[PDB]
């Protein structure tokens, strides 16, 4: 379910991920391994790296769920990037690919893509996976890149809301970007911004969540945010308790990340990240492991800055 190592290049990383998903001892023993339903390389690379397209199937823990993802590898030698794109869906249909174009459109309830930034070089990596969700973390020098997708845990029975699919990435996948970018829009999972976290509304609507507002982003998503880091909505001061959070006598408190929407029509609470928590920064940092009740948690920070409100921990089991 967990794997730490170094991949010689982005390709090496992707087949390492697929072998981990399809052959991890826990996954195979528990019958939670994922099934590959599509694997092609349609484009004719020119001044660019070969593009690998993979779509994988997912049963979930109980074996009764139908979950479909997609993964793409895209890069350009001239600009020196090897972006890895991600997306999700509820159905796949290979024949639904038009002559040319692309295949990601064939996914039922296709959603805008998120991506992870990397390049062809030995990169230390961290894999976390489970029958319902998977998380990716890559250590880039002093920068940490992360993304993931899976099922959230709503407080309502799965009978009426059986598809709580969520997809999150550091940056929007609609544009090609270089990992050396220093813009604030490039951040981690805990603090989505400008189409960095999409979630399937029970009404089959991929509602984006942004911790902070943005003129470029659509007005609809400004009313739905991640409360734990979005405390500024109610607080009347820039400085709040969250930004100044600190450990307690050596104990690092793990705070759950929530999904909430508050529009004119109504209010509803959706669920919580499975294995992602917020933690302080002082006297700590990335790569740190903390044990709470016998379960370990790793520490990571967003690429933009390593500040208190931009630091999160991920459960490793």
């Amino acid at each position: 379910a967990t794997e730490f190592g170094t991949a010689v290049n982005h390709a090496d990383l992707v087949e390492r991920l697929v072998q981990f998903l399809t052959a991890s001892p826990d996954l195979v023993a528990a019958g939670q391994a994922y099934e590959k339903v599509f694997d092609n390389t349609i484009p004719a690379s020119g001044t660019a790296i070969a593009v690998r397209q993979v779509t994988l199937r997912a049963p979930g823990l109980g074996g009764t769920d139908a979950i479909y993802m997609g993964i793409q590898s895209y890069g350009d030698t001239a600009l020196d990037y090897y972006n890895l794109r991600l997306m999700g869906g509820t159905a796949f249909n290979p024949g639904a690919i038009p002559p040319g174009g692309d295949y990601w459109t064939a996914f039922a309830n296709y959603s805008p893509r998120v991506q992870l930034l990397a390049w062809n070089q030995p990169m230390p990596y961290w894999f976390f996976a489970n029958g319902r969700r998977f998380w990716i973390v890559v250590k880039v020098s002093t920068i940490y890149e992360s993304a993931g997708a899976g099922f959230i845990l709503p407080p309502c029975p799965p009978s009426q809301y059986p598809y709580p699919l969520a997809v999150v990435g550091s940056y929007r996948g609609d544009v090609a970007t270089r990992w050396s970018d220093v813009s604030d829009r490039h951040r981690g999972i805990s603090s989505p911004y400008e189409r960095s976290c999409y979630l399937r509304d029970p009404a089959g609507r991929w509602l984006g969540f942004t911790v902070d507002g943005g003129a470029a982003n659509e007005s609809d998503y400004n009313n739905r945010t991640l409360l734990p880091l979005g405390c500024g909505r109610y607080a009347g001061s820039s400085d709040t308790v969250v930004k100044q959070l600190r450990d307690s006598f050596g104990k690092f408190p793990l705070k759950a990340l929530q999904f909430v929407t508050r529009e004119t029509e109504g209010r509803r609470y959706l669920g919580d990240f499975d294995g992602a928590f917020y933690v302080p920064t002082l006297n700590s940092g990335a790569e740190d492991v903390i044990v709470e009740d016998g379960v370990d948690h790793v520490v990571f920070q967003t690429a933009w800055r390593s500040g208190n409100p931009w630091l999160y921990a991920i459960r490793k089991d």
């Binding site: 509820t90 159905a91 249909n93 290979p94 024949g95 639904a96 690919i97 038009p98 002559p99 040319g100 174009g101 459109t105 064939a106 996914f107 039922a108 309830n109 296709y110 009404a203 089959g204 609507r205």
Partner: protein, 305 residues
């Protein structure tokens, strides 16, 4: 009911479809290797096979001494168009990947895959009256391509049941409506909108084109449900404009619907109720906004029996 096959030349399709029609009881007044003068209890039709295209025209009477485009009450001379041209379906040299044929005692539907990703529909039949009292209702449609290589679905292009096209010579499809506005019974109303002719007809043919004139275009656009990935059939209502721009709903296309393929492949099945549906693209699948080089995602949901 449902037939499939291959044809290296249009004459092969000609022979196979006549064989099927005769086996199903269709009455052919005159037959040949390239020309037809057939009819049924509903109406009369005439077809001619060119080197790389089919020529079709409606009819009301028979005369063996008249040419294929000179039968009594022919659409060539009895239409508002000044050009006086018959229906035309433009195809390729003849090499066809496959053809799917739907045959009934009242209508005939054909969908030929001329090449990989290239499809050309052909439609003949009569509209379901649905209790509406009117004479005629026979419809014959073809597929026309503007120019290979350039924008394939350009504005000048015409398609079956099209509601928006620019062309002064040929029409993709027609519709018979006898005795409209007190005129002579033989009247073949073409699918045109920009000619401002006193009498004309319009349909959802093009699907969800930007300048398509039909109120259901939204229904076709939203045919695919994002909740459960479910797709529904939208009746293809037809509209006829009177002498002074007063419209009259005329009916719906039998066993035919137009549906989106954002999330479906050519020929994939989706059974709705006890009836089964077959779905095949109009011309060629593209992206959402590719309304120039291909047919976008407009789909032809049919009922298979």
């Amino acid at each position: 009911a449902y037939f499939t096959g291959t044809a290296n030349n249009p004459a092969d399709l000609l022979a196979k479809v006549r064989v099927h029609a005769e086996s199903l009881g269709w009455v052919t007044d005159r037959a040949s290797a390239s020309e037809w003068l057939c009819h049924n209890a509903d109406g009369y039709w005439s077809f001619n096979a060119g080197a790389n295209q089919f020529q079709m025209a409606g009819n009301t009477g028979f005369d063996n001494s008249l040419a294929w485009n000179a039968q009594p009450g022919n659409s060539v001379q009895n239409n508002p168009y000044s050009s006086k041209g018959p229906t035309v379906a433009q195809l390729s040299g003849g090499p066809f990947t496959r053809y799917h044929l739907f045959a009934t005692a009242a209508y005939l539907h054909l969908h030929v895959e001329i090449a990989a990703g290239q499809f050309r529909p052909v439609m003949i039949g009569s509209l379901n009256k649905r209790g509406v009292g009117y004479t005629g209702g026979q419809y014959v449609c073809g597929s026309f391509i503007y120019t290979p290589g350039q924008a394939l679905t350009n504005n000048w292009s015409s398609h079956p049941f099209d509601g928006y096209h620019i062309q002064y010579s040929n029409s993709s499809c027609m519709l018979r409506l006898d005795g409209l506005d007190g005129g002579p019974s033989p009247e073949w109303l073409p699918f045109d909108y920009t000619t401002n002719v006193p009498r004309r007809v319009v349909g959802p043919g093009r699907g969800n084109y930007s300048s398509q004139y039909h109120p259901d275009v939204g229904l076709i656009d939203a045919s695919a449900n994002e909740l459960n990935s479910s797709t529904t059939t939208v009746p293809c209502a037809i509209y006829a404009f009177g002498a002074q721009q007063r419209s009259r709903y005329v009916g719906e296309v039998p066993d035919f619907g137009i549906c989106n393929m954002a999330f479906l492949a050519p020929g994939d099945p989706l059974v709705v109720g006890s009836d089964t549906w077959r779905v095949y693209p109009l011309l060629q699948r593209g992206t959402a906004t590719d309304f120039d080089s291909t047919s976008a995602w407009v789909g032809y949901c049919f009922r298979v029996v």
